[PDB]
Design a protein around this ligand. Structure first.
Ligand SMILES: [Cl-]
Ligand SMILES: [Cl-]
Ligand SMILES: [Zn+2]
Ligand SMILES: [Zn+2]
Lengths: 27, 21, 28, 21, 28, 21, 27, 21, 27, 21, 28, 21
């Protein structure tokens, strides 16, 4: 669960950092 | 992997950029 | 867009839950 | 694109699943 | 709605904090 | 409805509290 | 606190899964 | 309860549906 | 990391509680 | 500090108000 | 606003990540 | 104001950084 919660925040963060580039999320 | 790299320790913005396209 | 920007934030949260272990690419 | 399809109309979970790996 | 959809997401987060231990029903 | 009341105008915490149990 | 943080994510999740049905959150 | 069921272990989407109206 | 995740939720919360007043976040 | 005060134990709404402007 | 309200929520999340240890003031 | 600048046009991370301490 702790990992699940972290991923949610990772994804928001990648979203802001990467911008027009987009990103991949692979756990 | 990003879970390995960024959920055990906090990843800087520069680090997260590694996972952009 | 701004409206488009706010929406994307919610899209990725939703993809995160829906895709689960599979993961995803976000390309806008 | 996903922005095109799902920010103009609400996309269901099933529709969103199409963008998974 | 889409705008309505995005707003609902924020409504439930707010109800979560406001209602606390009481909890809530979300009916749209 | 809550969607009706609070997505057209901003609802305060006090207004939102009305929808608690 | 760990439980408080989890509930926030639960509620977002229920919101997406349930859709027009709506949901109840009772801790 | 959902806290019991879904905050100690991750609940699938199918599981969460149990808490819809 | 646990602290990082908590701050994100703190900030959303301060945002709702404080309203027009605004707030300061200092960790 | 707020991290000290509110990330080890849950802070009420009244408590959080201490950090408003 | 409502649109302005939803946007602010996303602004503070973004400032939180961007500012990091520095922190920030939110004044609207 | 930040609401003025960044809710009318999208503000980059660099623009947002201006509002840090
Ligand atoms: Cl969390
Ligand atoms: Cl939004
Ligand atoms: Zn969280
Ligand atoms: Zn939003």
């Amino acid at each position: 669960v702790n990992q699940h919660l972290c991923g949610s925040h990772l994804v928001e963060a990648l979203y802001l950092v990467c911008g027009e580039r987009g990103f991949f999320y692979t756990x | 992997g990003i879970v390995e790299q960024c959920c055990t320790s906090i990843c800087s913005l520069y680090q997260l950029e590694n996972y952009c396209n």
